Amino acid sequence: PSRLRKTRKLRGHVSHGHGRIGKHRKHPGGRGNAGGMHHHRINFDKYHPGYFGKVGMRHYHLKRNQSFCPTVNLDKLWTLVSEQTRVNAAKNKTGAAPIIDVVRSGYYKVLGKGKLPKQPVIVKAKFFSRRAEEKIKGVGGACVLVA
Amino acid sequence: APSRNGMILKPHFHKDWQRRVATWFNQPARKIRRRKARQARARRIAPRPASGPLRPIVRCPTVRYHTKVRAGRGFSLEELRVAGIHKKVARTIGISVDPRRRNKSTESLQANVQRLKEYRSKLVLFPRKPSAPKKGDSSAEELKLATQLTGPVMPIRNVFKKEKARVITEEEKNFKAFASLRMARANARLFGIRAKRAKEAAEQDVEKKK
RNA sequence: UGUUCACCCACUAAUAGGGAACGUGAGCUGGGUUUAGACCGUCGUGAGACAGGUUAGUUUUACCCUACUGAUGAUGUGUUGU
RNA sequence: CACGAUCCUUCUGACCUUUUGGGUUUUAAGCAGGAGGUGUCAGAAAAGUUACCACAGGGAUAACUGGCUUGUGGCGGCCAAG
RNA sequence: GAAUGGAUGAACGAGAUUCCCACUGUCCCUACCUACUAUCCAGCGAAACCACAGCCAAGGGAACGGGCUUGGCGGAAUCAG
RNA sequence: AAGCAUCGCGAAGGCCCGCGGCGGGUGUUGACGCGAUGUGAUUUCUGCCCAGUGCUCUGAAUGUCAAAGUGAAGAAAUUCA
RNA sequence: GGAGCGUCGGGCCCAUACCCGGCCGUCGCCGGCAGUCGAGAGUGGACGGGAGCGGCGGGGGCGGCGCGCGCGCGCGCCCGCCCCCGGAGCCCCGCGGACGCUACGCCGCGACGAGUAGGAGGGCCGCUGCGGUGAGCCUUGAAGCCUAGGGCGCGGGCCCGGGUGGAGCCGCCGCAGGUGCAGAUCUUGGUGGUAGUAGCAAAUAUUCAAACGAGAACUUUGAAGGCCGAAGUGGAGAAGGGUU
RNA sequence: CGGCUCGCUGGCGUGAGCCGGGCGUGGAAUGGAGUGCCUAGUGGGCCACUUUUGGUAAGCAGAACUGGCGCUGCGGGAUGA
RNA sequence: CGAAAGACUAAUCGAACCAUCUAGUAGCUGGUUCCCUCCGAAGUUUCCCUCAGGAUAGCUGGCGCUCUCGCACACGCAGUUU
RNA sequence: ACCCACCCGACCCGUCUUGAAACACGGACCAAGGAGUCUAACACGUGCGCGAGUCGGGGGCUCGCACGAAAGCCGCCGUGGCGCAAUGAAGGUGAAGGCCGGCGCGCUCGCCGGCCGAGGUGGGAUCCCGAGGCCUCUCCAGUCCGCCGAGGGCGCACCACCGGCCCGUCUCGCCCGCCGCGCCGGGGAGGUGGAGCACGAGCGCACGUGUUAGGACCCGAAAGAUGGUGAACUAUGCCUGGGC
RNA sequence: CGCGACCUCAGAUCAGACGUGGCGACCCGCUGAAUUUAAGCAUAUUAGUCAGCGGAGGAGAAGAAACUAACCAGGAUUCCCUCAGUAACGGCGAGUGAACAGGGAAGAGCCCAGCGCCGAAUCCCCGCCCCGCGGCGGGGCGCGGGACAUGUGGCGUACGGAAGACCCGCUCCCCGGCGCCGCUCGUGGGGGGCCCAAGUCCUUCUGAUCGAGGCCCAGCCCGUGGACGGUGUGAGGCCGGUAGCGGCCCCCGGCGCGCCGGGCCCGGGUCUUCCCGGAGUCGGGUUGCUUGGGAAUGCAGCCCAAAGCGGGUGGUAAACUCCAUCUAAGGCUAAAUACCGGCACGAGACCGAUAGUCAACAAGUACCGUAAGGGAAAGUUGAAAAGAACUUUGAAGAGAGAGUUCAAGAGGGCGUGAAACCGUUAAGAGGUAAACGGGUGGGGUCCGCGCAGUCCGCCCGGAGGAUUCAACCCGGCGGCGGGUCCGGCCGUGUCGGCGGCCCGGCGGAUCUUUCCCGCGCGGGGGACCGUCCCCCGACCGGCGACCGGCCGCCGCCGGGCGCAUUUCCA
Ligand SMILES: [Mg+2]
Ligand SMILES: [Mg+2]
Ligand SMILES: [Mg+2]
Ligand SMILES: [Mg+2]
Ligand SMILES: [Mg+2]
Ligand SMILES: [Mg+2]
Ligand SMILES: [Mg+2]
Ligand SMILES: [Mg+2]
Ligand SMILES: [Mg+2]
Ligand SMILES: [Mg+2]
Ligand SMILES: [Mg+2]
Ligand SMILES: [Mg+2]
Ligand SMILES: [Mg+2]
Ligand SMILES: [Mg+2]
Ligand SMILES: [Mg+2]
Ligand SMILES: [Mg+2]
Ligand SMILES: [Mg+2]
Ligand SMILES: [Mg+2]
Ligand SMILES: [Mg+2]
Ligand SMILES: [Mg+2]
Ligand SMILES: [Mg+2]
Ligand SMILES: [Mg+2]
Ligand SMILES: [Mg+2]
Ligand SMILES: [Mg+2]
Ligand SMILES: [Mg+2]
Ligand SMILES: [Mg+2]
Ligand SMILES: [Mg+2]
Ligand SMILES: [Mg+2]
Ligand SMILES: [Mg+2]
Ligand SMILES: [Mg+2]
Ligand SMILES: [Mg+2]
Ligand SMILES: [Mg+2]
Ligand SMILES: [Mg+2]
Ligand SMILES: [Mg+2]
Ligand SMILES: [Mg+2]
Ligand SMILES: [Mg+2]
Ligand SMILES: [Mg+2]
Ligand SMILES: [Mg+2]
Ligand SMILES: [Mg+2]
Ligand SMILES: [Mg+2]
Ligand SMILES: [Mg+2]
Ligand SMILES: [Mg+2]
Ligand SMILES: [Mg+2]
Ligand SMILES: [Mg+2]
Ligand SMILES: [Mg+2]
Ligand SMILES: [Mg+2]
Ligand SMILES: [Mg+2]
Ligand SMILES: [Mg+2]
Ligand SMILES: [Mg+2]
Ligand SMILES: [Mg+2]
Ligand SMILES: [Mg+2]
Ligand SMILES: [Mg+2]
Ligand SMILES: [Mg+2]
Ligand SMILES: [Mg+2]
Ligand SMILES: [Mg+2]
Ligand SMILES: [Mg+2]
Ligand SMILES: [Mg+2]
Ligand SMILES: [Mg+2]
Ligand SMILES: [Mg+2]
Ligand SMILES: [Mg+2]
Ligand SMILES: [Mg+2]
Ligand SMILES: [Mg+2]
Ligand SMILES: [Mg+2]
Ligand SMILES: [Mg+2]
Ligand SMILES: [Mg+2]
Ligand SMILES: [Mg+2]
Ligand SMILES: [Mg+2]
Ligand SMILES: [Mg+2]
Ligand SMILES: [Mg+2]
Ligand SMILES: [Mg+2]
Ligand SMILES: [Mg+2]
Ligand SMILES: [Mg+2]
Ligand SMILES: [Mg+2]
Ligand SMILES: [Mg+2]
Ligand SMILES: [Mg+2]
Secondary structure (H helix, E strand, O other): OHHHOHHHHHOOOOOOOOOOOOOOOOOOOOOOOOOOOOOOHHHHHHHOOOOOOOOOOOOOOOOHHHHOOOEEEHHHOHHHOOHHHHHOOOOOOOOOOOEEEHHHHOOOEEEOOOOOOOOOOEEEEOEEOHHHHHHHHHHOOEEEEOO | OOOOOOOOOOOOOOOOHHHHOOOOOOHHHHHHHHHHHHHHHHHHOOOOOOOOOEOOEEEOOHHHHOOOEEEOOOEOHHHHHHHOOOHHHHHHHOEOEOOOOOOOOHHHHHHHHHHHHHHHHOOOOOOOOOOOOOOOOOOHHHHOOOOOOOOOOOOOOOOOOOOOOOOOOOOOOOOOHHHHHHHHHHHHHHHHHHHHHHHHHHHHHHHHHO
């Protein structure tokens, strides 16, 4: 919508909002990220601390899927399963504890943020945190490694 | 020139890109054309599935996909050999065959034999002439269907086995997972040197004798 | 002497001093400065340099407005002439 | 006051990390601290000439006039030792 | 200052100087004449240039005004210069 | 410009072209010639300077001087000779 | 005998400054109004017993918190009532509520208003096309054009009258953009002043009569006077032209 | 005021940090405050009072301080940043 | 190509002309289209092969939010003074 | 609003500039044309939908498309993107604490049972409780309705401060674990680096402004590069003719 | 010095074939800048991009792993989405920059050399006959030529293959013709032709209407047709079309059946014995280019130069070592993909004659340039030419009358006809260039009046005329509002029915395989939970969600009411 834009309101005025002392010349700074070291340095090193320089190790044929390891927190572990597993449990009276295959739901690691409700579980997962393990045991459950 | 905060960003419009802009005003016209051509091909292969041939079940590669299962390119030779379909014939009954597939584990093999067996059950081979010889099915299962199969033939559905609620034996509860993982990491790490030091120590024991 | 300036001869009453975009190039002239051609000296490895010398080198337009010069006329006095 | 970023090099440091299908060893690559310098000292790697010259501009800036000033030049007082 | 050539030198030069004789309007010092113009007329008929325009003195002013301030003043339309 | 004076070359050569060729120009040529520079008819001269920058001559007597090749140690990349 | 200079009076002169008033806009007000009492607000109302001229017998405070338009009252007759706006008649009305209320509306009080570069808001300002919508307009005259006609708007602009014209065009709500010019030694086209001006001056030269003809300075014929003066203004080619 | 905490400090004590109570206008004048995001133009300046450096001085060059002009009309200063 | 003047090479030569790369780049000239309303600057900072430009502070606008109470019942802030 | 008169006022615009009526440039006049665009990427603001999710592409199913190259639908609804977790160069690791009771010597360390469950200080719009008024036509009783409300509380968001947790790192220390007792693995205390956590705010769509890359507001070089055309002029050589 | 084989080479206007140039949007192979960015510049970038050369096809190229990976593993090529502005490169600056996996579009796989077996079992050309002949083919017959053992053809190629013995089960696939049947998706494939609904109805405007009003239901008639165009304005019905699984005729394709001519004796498993791979290539060194590819991603030249349990890859140089993974140095292959050139169509929130292509027109034209090349301007009378007969002035161009046209105030460069600028006509002014702002005056032009503008409207009082009613009941209709929620429909929250629950379905990682069906899994039942529906009673919000009676009120029509009422008029 040109109708709404600013150039409609600038019609009539000479400079078109670019001033008349200094003008709208083509590329007064240099094109683009020109002068990162010289003559634009201050902007670079007060809004991009650490642009310039190497750091760390190269890694040639990176393939991301090798390092694939999506995490989930205890916080919302019960979310993976239907409420009626968490309900048929705190009930039942066998002391059963329902299984939660986390790898089925698409998380490999189980990290340990959050309060887990006092209600036993069997968490199957590829990897665990230390704390996530501990919390799980404290609920009265069992962590289970899977390949 | 940059002005107070923003991504120091690199656009790739320095070559003559407007010479190679590729618009998509086709796409509707395209989508139709494919669709017509699709419906034509069905009609040509008259009672044969529109899909194509039947294709194997197959697991993806890499740790990432790993858990999922797709359709593969074609059934291996072992899978045809065990099912008892002559490879040259299998092409003629709508069974995809690749021959470059290895077959590592017997769980993936027996599944894919089972597939072909099931296919052969629910297949309606018409006889060559209207006069009916062996193999060719009855005119009952022929009149009741010279019907095409819409969609992929015997589709693969990645499926899960429901685990019932156990009781947690004092042993599961005993397990120290995180520790176990740390241990298992370090033993892979240190396997190799440990073996070299033991090889050193064995040489020192033998060197003591001489 | 391109000179401004300078000096000398002569006359004279006297050979005072200045200004006008250092009056005055669609007024001239173009000798000199100050393109390009060339020579010499000094300087520069060199291309080249030199308020160092030399020689050769295109000086456009007015019919507009004004100003000035002269030329017909103009309003008035009824018209005309004296 | 007496000093120097990124990149690169070099040395020192840990039973350190990586060197990619796995293992051992050399090698290399990282991590951390010093050194090798940028004096145009917040840090290009860099000789002239053009009178054969060009282009973008500048009265932000020279070479005339004209303004301001009058040191300097020119001209004129006052005092009065001579 | 010596083949970055030195010194010379008859002949030659639309080459650079200086003097003398002759000759002359170069000048003292200007004048008269001729032809073609310019001029007036018939016919024909362009261009550059052009903010608006077009009388001065002084003032101030981006420090030399046609326009501003204060004074002088101002009379159609034109011709040749 | 004639005149003078240097310099290179005896042809698998001097000088030069060409993108390339058992290519081409000088050259249908051979030092009284081809090629490269200066000075500039004649006359008369043409001093000294080989430190500098050039050019050139010699070359196991010899400092440095690359790739290959030779040896060396190393498991090898290699390093050193 | 100032229209000079120094010291001082009264008086008068006028800026867009100051004061009062009008009108426009902006800002602010916990602004007001979806329908109610109420102007330093400092209550209103059940309802029960006991009673009545009683009351709440508190500061030269000069007073606000308490008093003289009634509390009980006139009527029905010491007892009853002290009644209902579909009717008190109203300055307040709690029974229902604008002429007003497109709540992006309407209304009230104050204050304030220079502006380049620049920023933002609003434009029932303007251009062209699209979805909607105006039972829109139009040969009984669309667009455009022109107008010493009538008006509106602060303005961008707009609307009507008349003329001209001869086929299409507009209002509103949305969307869209190749959307508004005085300048760019801007581009393309057109037109002036300059101007009936400069100019139609290289190479000696024309004159008389006639013919044709609407018409003769210039054609043609005749006569005269002139020039080129065989290195020609003569007589023939080459190239080039291409029907001259 | 009352009490707790300390791995600090130390003859005992410091000093700090915590809880729990108890007390209200603490000079004049004025004014509603705080706070966060996007952000253009600008980065040639000049002038006056006073102060002030260079300079014989300048409508010269250079600082300070405030206020101007620039961005700004209006009355006065005849004319005028 | 030049008996050398940087001469000449189709009115073009200190590098011809034609088409393209090409809408070449420009810290530099020039221009940059309707109305009202409200707010309204800077020419100073540090850095820059920086000094006719950028960066960065500053100065401007816009959007807000959080609270305050003239609804007899206020805290904080200042180009002052005490 | 057309013309004329008169008094007062009044230099020509545009532009660069500290300064323009300038003896600064551009501009004789009129018409039409004529310059901040579009794409991509980012950021912030705003509007809408859904919300620990969101998403639509790409693909597919529904039609000869009149309107359609639309519209609709999809275990593709989610392959996947962004988001929901960081931190380390990396190997890797990865956001909880409190309290109570018991057992280990409570050793501000190690292990076993119960309860609460995102800490605390100050300020915080707002809610909540509310002594007490303040009247009612009388003396008291007395529920109903307000108005205010001293005093006291829960305290959103947000801010400041102090605690805590996660990753990197250092320093100091003492214990645990077992299929592999090891140059194995795990924890503690105290600092200190992190674009962290501390009951989530994102995703998609749309508009606006700003900043960039692109012809990038419009106009402007001197140059540079590739491939072609010319010696009809002129330069020089050669061939064949002419002339003095 | 003969004749004859072959080998290597010539020549033929020998017989018969092919290749040459073009186009170039897309495609394949080379070649290859510089403007530009970096605020300078040389590496980098621009860019393997423009220009240059080569060669194609309807597509091209690529392609059946010397692949990915490191998994529980995928499995040719191309294309899209994603990966990802990521890993990486880089004066680590500017900047640049992939791949695998994952999801899709599509989907298709094959053949030699070799090693071997088979009397060369093979091929080409001659010549005679039968068919067929506008894509030169079949069949037969020839002591008719030649190619070929320096290797043709069948079997066979790594997914293994061959040959053998017995286990099994049985025998259609192809082409040259000749016919014939069903015209075979935009709903009869492709092409061609020719066809198919309804007003010129009534009035009326007009130069002419396709307009405006009407016409048994917005009017008549068709409507599977109201797209579009044309026709003297604006047309579903005047005409061409448009709609339609509408028609007919041609031709051609494609597929179905029959007959003939040929070819063709074409399997699989099981055990044994044999068989097996492309050299100046890989690989190394190198130099140069190239790449994100980094101690060398790919291509090159030069030098070296292999092997066979080898070789290649396994993204950091090397040695040792295990694993994994392909099988290189020969070849063919549709498809999804591309398409600013061509032929033929369709459309548009585009432009509307200084725009849009250079070009709406006798445009790559005229014109320029030696040449390469450059390159315009330019649309519109009217419905119809009805384009002005004739008279007259003039040598004529030009006029004046006349005429045509609705109009020439449309006259052949003619629709409309702005401005600059000019002519005239009218008015007004005039020595400080004009022009301008503010303020008045004078004159003009028109515009509104008034031949009193005393402007209207309520209510009232009076005097004159005027018809009918208000008021009042009565009968009818319609509307509102109300509570008794009275009676019934209606729906919110709650409770009761466990009643829909199987006569109520979906969802669930809840359960059960006591079930059923199909092969521990899939589908369906069967429990269970969550969610959505029937039955009646009770309480409550009695809600604009409605009905029925009753009430009250209002309004209209019709009755009555004749005149102290009732309106009208002046
Ligand atoms: Mg701006
Ligand atoms: Mg400007
Ligand atoms: Mg700027
Ligand atoms: Mg498919
Ligand atoms: Mg002079
Ligand atoms: Mg003069
Ligand atoms: Mg002159
Ligand atoms: Mg001279
Ligand atoms: Mg000279
Ligand atoms: Mg004259
Ligand atoms: Mg290995
Ligand atoms: Mg010179
Ligand atoms: Mg010079
Ligand atoms: Mg020269
Ligand atoms: Mg100056
Ligand atoms: Mg000398
Ligand atoms: Mg000598
Ligand atoms: Mg000399
Ligand atoms: Mg002037
Ligand atoms: Mg010499
Ligand atoms: Mg020497
Ligand atoms: Mg203002
Ligand atoms: Mg402005
Ligand atoms: Mg018409
Ligand atoms: Mg457009
Ligand atoms: Mg214009
Ligand atoms: Mg004349
Ligand atoms: Mg002749
Ligand atoms: Mg500036
Ligand atoms: Mg300025
Ligand atoms: Mg050049
Ligand atoms: Mg441009
Ligand atoms: Mg600059
Ligand atoms: Mg503001
Ligand atoms: Mg400037
Ligand atoms: Mg200046
Ligand atoms: Mg100006
Ligand atoms: Mg001046
Ligand atoms: Mg200029
Ligand atoms: Mg001019
Ligand atoms: Mg215009
Ligand atoms: Mg947003
Ligand atoms: Mg920004
Ligand atoms: Mg831009
Ligand atoms: Mg240009
Ligand atoms: Mg260059
Ligand atoms: Mg060809
Ligand atoms: Mg550059
Ligand atoms: Mg630049
Ligand atoms: Mg440069
Ligand atoms: Mg490149
Ligand atoms: Mg090309
Ligand atoms: Mg192909
Ligand atoms: Mg291959
Ligand atoms: Mg692949
Ligand atoms: Mg991303
Ligand atoms: Mg690249
Ligand atoms: Mg063979
Ligand atoms: Mg029509
Ligand atoms: Mg029609
Ligand atoms: Mg018809
Ligand atoms: Mg490269
Ligand atoms: Mg490796
Ligand atoms: Mg191929
Ligand atoms: Mg035209
Ligand atoms: Mg036109
Ligand atoms: Mg055109
Ligand atoms: Mg036109
Ligand atoms: Mg026309
Ligand atoms: Mg026209
Ligand atoms: Mg007409
Ligand atoms: Mg007309
Ligand atoms: Mg006309
Ligand atoms: Mg027309
Ligand atoms: Mg007159």
